[PDB]
Ligand binder design. Structure first.
Ligand SMILES: NC(=O)c1ccc[n+]([C@@H]2O[C@H](COP(=O)([O-])OP(=O)(O)OC[C@H]3O[C@@H](n4cnc5c(N)ncnc54)[C@H](OP(=O)(O)O)[C@@H]3O)[C@@H](O)[C@H]2O)c1
Ligand SMILES: NC(=O)c1ccc[n+]([C@@H]2O[C@H](COP(=O)([O-])OP(=O)(O)OC[C@H]3O[C@@H](n4cnc5c(N)ncnc54)[C@H](OP(=O)(O)O)[C@@H]3O)[C@@H](O)[C@H]2O)c1
Ligand SMILES: COc1ccc(-c2coc3cc(O)cc(O)c3c2=O)cc1
Lengths: 260, 260
């Protein structure tokens, strides 16, 4: 055994075809875990991630499942265990972002966002608890905008992740009976496809800057003067899911390089 | 004009036929507001509340609306404005509680709880913003279990109110363009019908104590050694919705008499 490694473990990451999830998946593989790479649409990207994990000497499988559909979450987990024999680690990463003034937010947009970000994560947790081996690990994904950062026209998304913060604290109580720790990571601005979607909203007068300028401005929000990257969130998930992270339990870690 | 009074104002309180909502509705009336008393099932109780408000010298109307149905929330607000001419204050109070180990929580139970506690409150807020006169007030209801108090088998409910905490902080940013302040009250154990239903969950071995005993035990959770009552939440809402509460905005006030 080595410090922080996952040799012999099997992990699952929702939405790990791209963005943060892809970096988490590859990293769990680098740490020695076998990985189930879940996607909803990005087949080609999911297979690239699988390949990278095989190339670095571990094993992986890509499995399609729409995390909005609870029956597909059940199946995703059954297929994980059926393929690899057992499951130790579940990272719930899938999410979508949204912007709109309260006055213009519709039923459909609420549902679109909450069905995945909150409901879906909740039942990923539930299936994780049911399928995980004792001593396992569950990590959900929140956001710095849930508590630490207040952005106009961001009420729906901020709320969707605020529920996750509460979930994980209480999940830890229930999941303790199988000695499974439960946490969430709350990234700030992390450079991915979602980053471009939201960067002009997160920055003061964002519409009147270029995408390159916005990224630089978001970099200066951290006192380390750099952007957050998927590897940064990966690094932290990897510690949380390791033996050594056990005493971090029921907590939400904000990962914004000190922006808050 | 007296400091802290609501003379000339019109307030609406969801689920004010009984429990905390009823105490809020009567108290807003006592402060001089005309009150729209919303209910979903408690017709008889809603009319008692209306009567109390008339008897203390103000005016009120009972309006049925299922806060789970966004179209009924729209209609509730239209009927409010149609009856009284305008609307200044909206208190979102309706909610249901739930208990269950993560592993056993179903889709239907998630939906039952979130549709009212989170989704419904969201769209009450939305319709409140659209209908409210400038300088108005919105107050949602969270819970001490959202952040401050951690109870096993309470993940669903705690999350449902954790989203509300986030909502109100961002709602304040959007609602500022009509100078509407937005807050939430997060009660702890407050003696109502919901209290008695579920007090045995909040206490180790609760099933083997009397309802009386359970209430006394909840009393001792506060260092004031008494239970929280509906009037206590009413007292605070009444301050928040007044002129003098304006500078409290985007905040969640935990009302547990110092238990936390
Ligand atoms: N990026 C940021 O700056 C940032 C900041 C705060 C929080 N977050 C949170 O971090 C998480 C990852 O974000 P990201 O930056 O990786 O976003 P991204 O670049 O948009 O990628 C989002 C991921 O979600 C997956 N997904 C979308 N709908 C899905 C569904 N129905 N079922 C299963 N998976 C689905 C996508 O895969 P498909 O292509 O297969 O749909 C994709 O892998 C999200 O939960 C987000 O809320 C991100
Ligand atoms: N008591 C506590 O210790 C406590 C603690 C934390 C938070 N809270 C929160 O405080 C609020 C009220 O608590 P409570 O103790 O008064 O509960 P309660 O005694 O059960 O009262 C609930 C109220 O909500 C209404 N309601 C239920 N379903 C509804 C629907 N579909 N549409 C509209 N209204 C509906 C009920 O009206 P009908 O009878 O007409 O349905 C009733 O007036 C809730 O938001 C709750 O989460 C209470
Ligand atoms: C002696 O310790 C305790 C601690 C907590 C309670 C308690 C009991 O019932 C409740 C019912 C509610 O609806 C909401 C609550 O918030 C509580 C409590 O907080 C009762 C006794």
């Amino acid at each position: 055994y080595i410090p922080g490694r996952l040799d012999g473990k099997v992990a699952l990451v929702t939405g790990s075809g791209r963005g943060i999830g892809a970096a988490v998946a590859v990293h769990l593989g680098r740490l020695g875990a076998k990985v189930v790479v879940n996607y909803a649409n990005s087949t080609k990207d999911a297979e690239k991630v699988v390949s990278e994990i095989k190339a670095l000497g571990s094993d992986a499988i890509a499995i399609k499942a729409d995390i909005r559909q609870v029956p597909e979450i059940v199946k995703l987990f059954d297929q994980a265990v059926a393929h690899f024999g057992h499951l130790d680690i579940a990272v719930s990463n899938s999410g979508v972002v949204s912007f709109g003034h309260l006055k213009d937010v519709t039923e459909e947009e609420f549902d679109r966002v909450f069905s995945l970000n909150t409901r879906g994560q909740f039942f990923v947790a539930r299936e994780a608890y049911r399928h995980l081996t004792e001593g396992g690990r569950i990590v959900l994904t929140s956001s710095n905008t849930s508590k630490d950062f207040s952005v106009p026209k961001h009420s729906l998304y901020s709320g969707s992740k605020g529920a996750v913060d509460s979930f994980v604290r209480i999940f830890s109580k229930d999941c303790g009976d199988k000695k499974i720790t439960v946490n969430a990571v709350a990234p700030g601005g992390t450079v991915t496809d979602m980053f471009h979607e939201v960067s002009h909203h997160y920055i003061p007068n964002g519409t009147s800057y270029t995408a390159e300028q916005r990224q630089q401005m978001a970099a200066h929000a951290s006192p380390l003067h750099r952007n957050g990257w998927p590897q940064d969130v990966a690094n932290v998930v990897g510690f949380l899911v390791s033996k050594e992270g056990e005493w971090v339990n029921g907590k939400v870690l904000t990962l914004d390089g000190g922006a808050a």
